[PDB]
Design a protein around this ligand. Structure first.
Ligand SMILES: [Ca+2]
Ligand SMILES: [Ca+2]
Ligand SMILES: [Ca+2]
Ligand SMILES: [Ca+2]
Ligand SMILES: [Ca+2]
Ligand SMILES: [Ca+2]
Ligand SMILES: [Ca+2]
Ligand SMILES: [Ca+2]
Lengths: 132, 158, 132, 132, 132, 132, 132, 158, 158, 157
């Protein structure tokens, strides 16, 4: 019965330990992603699937760490590394059992994020598979 | 209060400072948004034939975090902000490579000037693009010996 | 009720500004994706999830731009760069709301893609989630 | 409904041609995946979306010697020895038509796969789409 | 008059046991060093200060192949090929006494030597101190 | 007749695109190096030897460049890179033939220099060899 | 008129908090550096250029601290560091205004230096420039 | 204007807040300088026996560019500034590993108060430094179960 | 009309010209497909014991986009097409590392000759494959001094 | 009083304990020097054809500071000294990687044989790889010993 899906591309670059703010939302059924807090308040408990790809800032920084975190627990991570300072995707895809009200969000652990304004390079997209 | 002009989606552009902004407006800014900071780079070439610095001033800078609403703040931070009034020669070829480029015409608080920009693909530049790149390269060469190299692109021409 | 899912691996090396044409079709329900067309024609309005990985050719070039596009407006992009002519994927994954009669396909923004025979290094796979 | 989905990360590094046994299972809804086995047995035939990401770790091996001689006899010998960990992602995602008793697993065809004790860098996640 | 001083950087990469052909000579006062020769020849007997710096460039490109196979038959293949180009200058300074006709050279005793076309990452410079 | 010789260790840390201004001057014979200006004003045209060693910031950053530039022309470079974020010295020694009034100075082209107090870890020192 | 220059490659493996004693004295003009003492006793006042390179022993230790000090004060320093116990130099160079009766000597601050018989891996070379 | 005092060249040092500064100066800062920012690390240990927070407040912040002449500016920029009143227990352990550390005693505009600082190697700490390291580790260890990890150094003691 | 054979699944193989194609067929082409164009590389080996070119022509060229049909077209393009016919020595080796190799036997409009091919993991070649290359590496050297290098492989052996 | 020998500049050498030092001398030591302890590694090899432990004793150690003139002190410290009398098989292999290797013949002969090999840690010579193979095969032909000895990347038929 529940129908929830979302897909937001990154608009502005984010550096330092912080919660990346995905703003270019292309599809937001259910409206469970607030670009303001870069979070996914899951109102409907169940199983969700989230994939995310983050581009490395070319020319500035060499290794950037990214972690998808539910509440305060880091459930997935990626590491984009390139000595020559070229671009390289830090990407991952996860299936999670979200409870009622929990929040899942990307936290860059060092490194510099790169985000085409509308080239929608770095994306973060999820949808629910089963409902509890 | 500042008036803005967002020009994007073009390859080559030639303008005069009078067209963009009249003397009626105290302080205003003109904005460029490189289509892809990864596929294209910006090459700037201007000509100030007897530019009037006493009346107004021009500044150029790069920005990336949607900060054109805090320009004065940026002026305090000095984020790669450079004037072009004290420049010796009129034929300056500033080459940039950031998401956004802002040129501020500020009153201290006009067809003679000309400005031009080009976008160049870092891998396979277009024939006309490189070709006019060579043209103003020869213009720089003819002038003294100015530093007209500036990481010569792969563009090959006579 | 509606069963629509497709997955095809690339077969011939494509280079330049041409649409990629995945031909090694492995799974194709409903027969909506034509390997020859290399495109996915939506006939069942709804929401779809499309993930694609494209392999940069080794020994030639340094930059590879793969951009998924539905109809004529690009909706996603991906870059692969390696200075010493290595192999690096240009992947992405996007959830899109496709009404009736929409076309979606991977367009190649310059570079040279790999020419895997049947190893299926480059892959394109999508499936529907909800019906409108 | 089938009610099948799983997602697991890897803790112990792997080598050789042995199959990758993703042990740190985050969710194994349906218990069709053995964390220790790192393999997945299809008990409900149908279409399954699978995806895997692995973090390669380059074995450390680099050195160099420079030598200054007058007419041949050694006078100065200098060494340059720097070793780092090559980190890049090998990733893919497929749609498979599994039947009863089919087996799905990751087999390393040579290379090194980095393993986080709880860092969760190498992921393997799958879920059913349709029931046959 | 002593009048001996020279300084040159390296443009073309070198490999094996070959002498370094320092080509980008900035100052060759005294004409005691010849680019074609690649070896500083002594025409004024005395004491010299020599020094050399060379940038290492590893060639241990590391690759990994992951396979996802149904029952043994390969369904997905992923390639991860990357070298991180270790960077560590190798250098030393030496005070040697040289007579008439003596020649000195920089011999790469194994490894790769990075070459900067105009960046001059690797340098070799010397000058006379006393005349015999 | 000329008696110019200088040697200054770095007192305050500098980062980003910025000319380094070594302050802890231990010897400034001839007084041709202003600590704040971080530059060497050549008032005695001739041949000079400049050596410099810069310590990279540990716990912050991975790779830093360093260019010694006479006027605007870059005439030297040094790269210090270490994946463990460990300290590694970017060092280079060059010989120039400066004219009257030409200024030579170290500019940091990206990277996070260090901030030693009296540990004089990073230094920049030069002296004249011949007088024109 | 004064002729003071010297170059000494290390011979014995020094470790701990002790003065490095260079013994392979290749050249010594004026017989000022006493090899047994390991320190350079200046008798003609002037400005002396002293450079030193010390190679960290591989396999043991993580940090290599090389302190060039005049009399008792520290006038220079050097830090070699590698996580995996490889070979890295801790070199430096200083221009000092030494009056009559001064003694200069490298001082190993904790750790273990390399022990090269004739490989002259670790070197120490100085020379007067101006006469006081 | 603020009065300052630079303590450097010492290994183990205990003092008091009023000891560093009395209630005659309204706002002042006491600065500690790490003798070696690469080999030495700073371990602080404060004890607040019913401290008077209404009268004045104590703050801590680390800097590197000798910029203690613009402290208020740092207060606006919030460069890792931590307070000492909201801390629950009197024995709260903090690990600052940089170059310059500063404690600011500010009036809002005393033997009970006790502070301590130590310098320790990240490779080979002295048995003396190891023992005292154990002392505060022990007090925290016997507090509830506090996070007395403090990056457990090599120092291993019964 | 041309007769073609798709041979795959073997590492080491030996063939004679008369087995694949007799004189009955005017023009035919034999094909070899690299199992994986990244993990393996292809090495060819022909031995022409007085091979006659006056009767038929033998050519070699690589393809990637399934051009084995438009052979004539390829003749107009001339994409890396060589002939073991004009080989000064019967034992000439050509380093071919691409996706598809093809050998054209065409009449211009026999156990004596012997053809063999090997594929090796450019990372960890097998003991057999490395050994067979050694068996013939010296053979070419034994020849005059031919260029038996073929970028000597990394395979470990005498 | 002790008799010593400085052997340097060789790659491969096969010797017998008789020609090393005679029985006339009570206790002596033999020393080997590695020309470069960074690029070269050493591989010792010996074979005791009914060696007499009752008569003499053979030991091995590695020193790095010209300390063969006070060996007794090092013996007291026991700087990683290996004896070769209790060894079950005659072909016991050791990976000595230092700057100086010393073998002590001490009072408490073509039968006993000794060999040593130097190798480039990165690009060993073809001879070296061949001979590395020789001792490798012989170790196995000896049951199954751990003839890995830091299994070298060198592979040969
Ligand atoms: Ca990469
Ligand atoms: Ca990648
Ligand atoms: Ca595009
Ligand atoms: Ca050497
Ligand atoms: Ca290093
Ligand atoms: Ca495979
Ligand atoms: Ca170094
Ligand atoms: Ca020290």
């Amino acid at each position: 019965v529940p129908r929830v899906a979302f897909y937001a591309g990154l608009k502005n670059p984010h550096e330092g330990y912080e919660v990346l703010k995905f703003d270019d939302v292309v599809t937001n059924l259910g409206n469970n992603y607030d670009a303001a807090s870069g979070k996914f308040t899951c109102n409907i408990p169940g199983t969700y699937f989230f994939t995310y790809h983050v581009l490395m800032r070319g020319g500035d920084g060499t290794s950037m760490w990214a972690d998808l975190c539910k509440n305060g627990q880091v459930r997935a991570s990626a590491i984009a590394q390139d000595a020559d300072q070229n671009y390289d995707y830090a990407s991952n895809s996860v299936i999670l059992h979200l409870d009622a009200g929990d929040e899942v969000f990307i936290k860059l652990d060092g490194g510099k994020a790169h985000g085409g304004n509308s080239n929608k390079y770095s994306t973060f997209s999820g949808f629910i598979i089963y409902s509890d | 209060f500042w008036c803005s002009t967002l020009v994007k989606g073009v390859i080559y552009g030639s303008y005069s400072v009078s067209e963009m902004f009249p003397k009626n407006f105290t302080n205003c800014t003109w904005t460029l948004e490189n289509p892809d900071p990864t596929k294209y780079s910006i090459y700037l070439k201007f000509s100030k034939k007897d530019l009037s610095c006493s009346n107004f001033s021009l500044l150029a800078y790069q920005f990336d975090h949607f900060s054109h609403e805090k320009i004065k703040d940026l002026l305090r931070k000095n984020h790669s902000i450079m004037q072009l009034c004290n420049s010796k020669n009129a034929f300056v070829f500033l080459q940039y490579d950031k998401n956004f480029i802002q040129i501020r015409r500020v009153f201290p608080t006009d067809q003679k000037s000309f400005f031009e920009f080009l976008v160049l693909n870092k891998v396979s530049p277009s024939q006309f693009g490189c070709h006019v790149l060579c043209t103003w390269l020869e213009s720089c060469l003819k002038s003294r010996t100015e530093s007209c190299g500036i990481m010569y692109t792969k563009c090959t021409c006579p």
